Design a binder for this molecule. Structure first.
Ligand SMILES: [Cl-]
Ligand SMILES: [Cl-]
Ligand SMILES: [Cl-]
Ligand SMILES: [Cl-]
Ligand SMILES: [Cl-]
Ligand SMILES: [Cl-]
Ligand SMILES: [Cl-]
Ligand SMILES: [Mg+2]
Ligand SMILES: [Mg+2]
Ligand SMILES: [Mg+2]
Ligand SMILES: [Mg+2]
Ligand SMILES: [Mg+2]
Ligand SMILES: [Mg+2]
Ligand SMILES: [Mg+2]
Ligand SMILES: [Mg+2]
Ligand SMILES: [Mg+2]
Ligand SMILES: [Mg+2]
Ligand SMILES: [Mg+2]
Ligand SMILES: [Mg+2]
Ligand code: NA
Ligand code: NA
Ligand code: NA
Ligand code: NA
Ligand code: NA
Ligand code: NA
Ligand code: NA
Ligand code: NA
Ligand code: NA
Ligand code: NA
Ligand code: NA
Ligand code: NA
Ligand SMILES: [Sr+2]
Ligand SMILES: [Sr+2]
Ligand SMILES: [Sr+2]
Ligand SMILES: [Sr+2]
Ligand SMILES: [Sr+2]
Ligand SMILES: [Sr+2]
Ligand SMILES: [Sr+2]
Ligand SMILES: [Sr+2]
Ligand SMILES: [Sr+2]
Lengths: 150, 142, 142, 49
RNA sequence: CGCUCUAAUUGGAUGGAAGCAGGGGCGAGAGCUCCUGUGGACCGAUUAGUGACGAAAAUCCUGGCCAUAGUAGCAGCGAUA
RNA sequence: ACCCUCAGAAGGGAGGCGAAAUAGAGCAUGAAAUCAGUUGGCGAUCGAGCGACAGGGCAUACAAGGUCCCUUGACGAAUGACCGAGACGCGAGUCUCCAGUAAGACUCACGGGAAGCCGAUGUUCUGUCGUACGUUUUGAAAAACGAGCCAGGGAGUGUGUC
């Protein structure tokens, strides 16, 4: 799996990670990109709004065929990846929790760093016409999160 | 408090007028990169030089813009060929006994990378006393 | 709206192509030029064949497009663009620092460039830019 | 006989593939094939004296 | 020029070998060499040999991987649940 | 191990062991293709064998390269004047002298200067040239054939005789 790709002073920061998550890697890049720089609490409110359908997640890179959303600012395509959002909520729950256990104010901390990495694929096979089978796999995702005092 | 290199680091060799002229020429004229044709168009094709062999090869046929092809005409001057940019002729050294017979006025010594810190210390102190410059010196805190 | 031109050229009774050539080079030399009295610029030859050529340029076109100007304003400007490498940076700079005007929006009188003058007492076979534009269907706003 | 213990056959033209002997979907025998024979290997019959 | 192993002669390495990464120097060039980081145990040179010795290509072989794409499909059958 | 988190023998956080956990289980090393994040350069008015060679911008910890710029002066190949004087030509212009003089690439010396400064490396802009590579062919950018990409694999070998 991954290792934190960014330095982190333990005196002013808290960490957290998700391991081998079977969820969209493409949705994860989008979600991280959008919540980075936010307050943990702000991120949670955001992700909950996404899951609810009130706030869209801008799909800037993986947008083929994605219909436009009026609430997306400065861009057009967007969706509501609720599964990956829930996984990120778990990540934030763990991070904020760690932060609190260390004496920090979890929710208030800034998401200094957050990035998803494709760690592999869970392999599957799907029978097709003409006597052959093709790949039918699940992405495996790791994601790192660093909360920093500010 | 600061880093200082061991040995005669600033030493320059004494060259004849003609040798200094040729060294200066080699440095002025230089030469083309001489990388394999199209090495930049394909990652599996390395930069290492290979004679363009294709019957239709643009570089092989010598079209301007397709890069120069290796020829003896590109050779550096005999009298200075192989010299370090400083003008010193290089001497590969693996131990102290390799310093014997070396002229520190004309030659500079280069300690092989495999040589350990222990042996390098001796080679370096012996080289300095013999008036020989060590091209790859150890930087000590002084 | 205000064009600080280093040179102001009077096109009245002057051979369009010859003016265009000099304005092109001057523009490439860094000069900011303003071609004034465009409607009175002149081109030699048989009116019928001249108009036939400009009419064909108006009729040419398709989805990609061949937008050819009908006013003396744009015709002269286009004539100049054809003598400038308008797709290169240096060429576009030159072209963009040149402007053609209907009438004379300046207080000064433009200067008549050497060799571009046409003597009406010695020529009967010529057409005015404004006359071509009228035939082309442009609204005579001059 | 190394690399030759296979009944591998080539499919020829028709399936968008190189005419390389295959067995159970694997290329076999030929020197360019992984697990294939060695083209010009050391030979016992060679006089080394 | 470079690769493997053999022999003779002669050297390097836990005070850090090979390999790898980034970078400096030399050679027309094959390619040689140094520095730094990683690595943690092996590595050369000369000379005489040995050869399963050099790849951009063969609809070449095997393995790994990207775009394709969050796309097609997850509707159609007299059993619409 | 213990503690915190969690639906949790999961995972995460902290922690403990060891020279090393970036040795924590297909667990020595860890290339390329390639992915995430990020740094430098370019970027929403502009054109396509992706570059070679020149030259500008911006970028650069050390080490392993240390050069480079301007005044002046010395040397000075081929080439080679202006000005002026005199003489011709309808004219554009030319001849003679000045003079093979001034100039003239490189290189060097004095004086002054640069340390992102010179080289170099990354990217980009400008100029010149430029329709891959290999093969088939009289003729290949080819609307002839081959290849998605990378790593590794992949073709003059043996006996006998001449
Ligand atoms: Cl994916
Ligand atoms: Cl030679
Ligand atoms: Cl049109
Ligand atoms: Cl142009
Ligand atoms: Cl007339
Ligand atoms: Cl010289
Ligand atoms: Cl042969
Ligand atoms: Mg759609
Ligand atoms: Mg079947
Ligand atoms: Mg390449
Ligand atoms: Mg085999
Ligand atoms: Mg020997
Ligand atoms: Mg090989
Ligand atoms: Mg394959
Ligand atoms: Mg599609
Ligand atoms: Mg019903
Ligand atoms: Mg490992
Ligand atoms: Mg070939
Ligand atoms: Mg034919
Ligand atoms: Na909006
Ligand atoms: Na919008
Ligand atoms: Na005309
Ligand atoms: Na038109
Ligand atoms: Na078998
Ligand atoms: Na194929
Ligand atoms: Na034998
Ligand atoms: Na540059
Ligand atoms: Na062929
Ligand atoms: Na070809
Ligand atoms: Na063709
Ligand atoms: Na494929
Ligand atoms: Sr896209
Ligand atoms: Sr070393
Ligand atoms: Sr001109
Ligand atoms: Sr057939
Ligand atoms: Sr081989
Ligand atoms: Sr895929
Ligand atoms: Sr249904
Ligand atoms: Sr730990
Ligand atoms: Sr002279």
């Amino acid at each position: 799996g991954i290792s934190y790709s960014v330095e982190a002073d333990p005196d002013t920061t808290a960490k957290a990670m998700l391991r081998e998550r079977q969820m969209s890697f493409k949705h994860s890049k989008a979600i991280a990109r959008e919540i980075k720089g936010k307050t943990a609490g702000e991120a949670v409110d955001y992700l909950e709004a996404v899951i609810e359908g009130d706030q869209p997640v801008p799909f800037k890179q993986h947008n083929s065929g994605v219909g436009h959303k009026s609430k997306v600012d400065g861009w057009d395509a967007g969706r509501y990846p609720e599964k990956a959002s829930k996984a990120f909520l778990d990540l934030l729950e763990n991070a904020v929790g760690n932060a609190d256990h260390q004496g920090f104010d979890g929710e208030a901390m800034t998401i200094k760093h957050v990035a998803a990495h494709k760690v592999g694929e869970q392999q599957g096979r799907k029978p097709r016409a003409m006597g052959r089978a093709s790949a039918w796999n699940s992405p495996q995702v790791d994601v790192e999160l660093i909360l920093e005092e500010p | 408090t600061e880093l200082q290199a061991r040995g005669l680091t600033e030493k320059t060799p004494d060259l004849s007028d003609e040798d200094a002229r040729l060294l200066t020429q080699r440095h002025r004229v230089g030469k083309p990169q001489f990388n394999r044709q199209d090495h930049h168009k394909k990652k599996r094709v390395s930069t290492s030089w290979r004679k363009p062999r294709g019957q239709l090869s643009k570089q092989r046929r010598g079209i301007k813009g397709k890069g120069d092809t290796v020829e003896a005409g590109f050779r550096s001057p005999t009298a200075v060929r192989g010299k370090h940019p400083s003008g010193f002729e290089e001497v590969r050294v693996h131990n102290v006994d390799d310093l014997e017979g070396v002229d520190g006025d004309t030659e500079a010594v280069r300690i092989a990378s495999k040589v350990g810190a222990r042996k390098r210390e001796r080679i370096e102190e012996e080289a300095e006393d013999a008036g020989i410059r060590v091209l790859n010196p150890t930087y000590v805190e002084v | 709206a205000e064009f600080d031109a280093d040179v102001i050229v009077d096109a009245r009774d002057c051979i369009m192509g010859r003016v265009a050539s000099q304005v092109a080079e001057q523009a490439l030399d860094g000069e900011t030029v303003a071609v004034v009295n465009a409607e009175r610029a002149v081109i030699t030859g048989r009116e019928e064949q001249i108009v036939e050529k400009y009419e064909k340029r108006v009729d040419i076109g398709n989805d990609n497009g061949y937008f050819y100007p009908k006013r003396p304003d744009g015709i002269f400007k286009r004539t100049i663009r054809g003598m400038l490498p308008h797709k290169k940076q240096r060429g576009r700079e030159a072209f963009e620092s040149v402007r053609v005007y209907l009438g004379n929006p300046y207080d000064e009188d433009g200067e008549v460039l050497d060799g571009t003058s046409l003597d009406r007492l010695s020529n009967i076979k010529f057409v005015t830019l404004g006359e071509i534009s009228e035939t082309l269907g442009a609204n005579k706003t001059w | 006989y190394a690399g030759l213990r296979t009944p591998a056959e080539s499919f020829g033209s028709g399936r968008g593939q190189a005419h390389v002997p295959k067995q159970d979907g694997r290329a076999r025998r030929v020197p360019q094939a992984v697990k294939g024979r060695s083209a010009h290997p050391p030979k016992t019959e060679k006089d080394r004296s």
